[PDB]
Amino acid sequence: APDREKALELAMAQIDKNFGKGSVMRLGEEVRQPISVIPTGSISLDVALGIGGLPRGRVIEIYGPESSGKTTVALHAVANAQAAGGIAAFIDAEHALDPEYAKKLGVDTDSLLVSQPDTGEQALEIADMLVRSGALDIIVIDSVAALVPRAEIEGLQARLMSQALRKMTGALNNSGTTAIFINQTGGKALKFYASVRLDVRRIETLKDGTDAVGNRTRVKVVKNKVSPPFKQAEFDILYGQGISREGSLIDMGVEHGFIRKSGSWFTYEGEQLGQGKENARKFLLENTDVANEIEKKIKEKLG
């Protein structure tokens, strides 16, 4: 009965010791909690991460198929980091960004540090020195696959990438700046350096009755060295409004009881919210007072 675990316990101990914390976990441990993390902007996912957001100082990767969310999540990461006083950097390699939309997500475009390098070898250095001023909070490279090296422009990528990754990884940990990498490629490197990888995919094209308000998405946390991995969260991203914070309260609201679905009628302890997800969504939208209370409750019922 005892001894085995005890040997295990000690085992699992020494591992983490020489290999860090997330070395050995259980798809059941409720462990850790850093006083630092960035709200995804969708609790659903925040919880997904276990820690309630992104592990600062860690290199995260959010890969997904063309037109899944990725950037959106990302720009959210950058917006929530922003509204906290620290400022964000955008390494542009895709030359495709819609500030407006960003602004709508919450991005302070005027104060967003961007840079459209010339070769893949160039961005990284930029990102690397720019990250060395530890003045940044969230730096985000856009398009791992759009990092063509000096050579080709005149197995390169993987290499090019590995190099900085090892280099930038060190510092990132020392400065407390968390990094984002969009992907589709450079594979290897990132695969391993990243301490958290999100796999994002668009499941349903949200039916608005009319023709479409957005799309319901799903992110699977294939790799999480800071909490139990393999989790996942689903949320909606309304065309031109980003992730509906309200849209999420409901889902968690119900998947955790704080709200009752009485047959296409949403109710919150006594009084009803609305009749229909969007209706109740509308409801909370204009009833933030109550809205945050749910978020609050949900955060209390879990952390």
Side-chain angles (χ1 to χ4, degrees), residues 1-3 5-9 11-17 19-28 30-99 101-102 104-172 174-207 209-226 228-257 259 262-280 283-284 286-297 299-303:
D3 57 47
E5 292 294 304
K6 203 155 196 167
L8 180 58
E9 202 195 76
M12 204 162 153
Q14 294 144 182
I15 301 189
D16 283 10
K17 287 167 59 181
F19 306 130
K21 271 295 305 174
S23 291
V24 218
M25 301 189 84
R26 303 222 203 173
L27 317 199
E30 306 268 302
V31 98
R32 197 176 172 183
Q33 198 96 62
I35 39 65
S36 61
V37 99
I38 309 183
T40 55
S42 164
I43 184 70
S44 173
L45 182 31
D46 289 319
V47 281
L49 307 155
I51 63 181
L54 295 189
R56 304 185 136 223
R58 296 301 118 61
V59 38
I60 315 94
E61 180 197 317
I62 321 159
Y63 68 98
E66 254 205 290
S67 302
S68 79
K70 303 143 60 59
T71 46
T72 311
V73 174
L75 301 176
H76 277 308
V78 170
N80 285 316
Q82 205 158 42
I87 320 196
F90 204 73
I91 285 45
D92 179 22
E94 279 275 301
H95 297 158
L97 187 64
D98 192 325
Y101 187 71
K104 265 185 179 177
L105 312 174
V107 180
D108 197 52
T109 71
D110 271 52
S111 68
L112 193 192
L113 290 158
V114 178
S115 162
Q116 299 166 148
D118 306 306
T119 73
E121 306 197 20
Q122 196 185 67
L124 297 186
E125 271 306 309
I126 290 195
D128 216 324
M129 52 189 71
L130 191 56
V131 59
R132 297 188 196 281
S133 89
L136 268 294
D137 292 45
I138 183 58
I139 186 172
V140 51
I141 289 88
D142 190 359
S143 258
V144 162
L147 268 41
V148 320
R150 260 261 186 176
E152 167 163 33
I153 183 174
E154 233 137 56
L156 309 147
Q157 286 188 270
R159 168 284 167 188
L160 129 73
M161 283 283 272
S162 306
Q163 304 290 307
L165 254 311
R166 171 187 190 182
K167 170 153 43 167
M168 187 179 293
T169 208
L172 270 167
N174 290 182
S175 66
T177 297
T178 160
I180 309 188
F181 281 82
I182 294 56
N183 212 49
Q184 235 68 40
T185 357
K188 301 190 183 293
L190 207 38
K191 183 199 182 76
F192 291 122
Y193 277 102
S195 309
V196 171
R197 283 152 40 75
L198 288 67
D199 180 6
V200 185
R201 298 193 294 223
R202 245 192 59 193
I203 157 177
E204 171 52 57
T205 327
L206 256 291
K207 293 168 278 57
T210 165
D211 38 355
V213 268
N215 331 90
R216 169 142 247 244
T217 302
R218 171 181 293 165
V219 179
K220 192 189 296 179
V221 69
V222 295
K223 187 183 186 178
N224 191 321
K225 301 300 301 170
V226 83
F230 300 120
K231 263 52 193 179
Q232 55 161 271
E234 275 186 59
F235 49 79
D236 311 301
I237 301 167
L238 313 306
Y239 294 108
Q241 220 157 194
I243 293 165
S244 181
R245 166 186 165 176
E246 301 62 357
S248 194
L249 277 314
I250 294 93
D251 293 290
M252 305 312 261
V254 294
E255 189 163 353
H256 280 56
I259 303 175
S262 325
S264 272
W265 259 114
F266 294 102
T267 158
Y268 181 49
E269 63 178 12
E271 36 86 28
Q272 58 178 57
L273 287 40
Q275 213 174 186
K277 182 165 296 186
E278 204 49 58
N279 218 53
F283 179 80
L284 301 169
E286 72 178 308
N287 287 285
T288 217
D289 62 291
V290 54
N292 306 174
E293 162 178 354
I294 288 67
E295 172 170 57
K296 197 178 180 300
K297 296 212 168 184
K299 282 188 178 174
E300 306 201 319
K301 185 73 67 181
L302 290 162

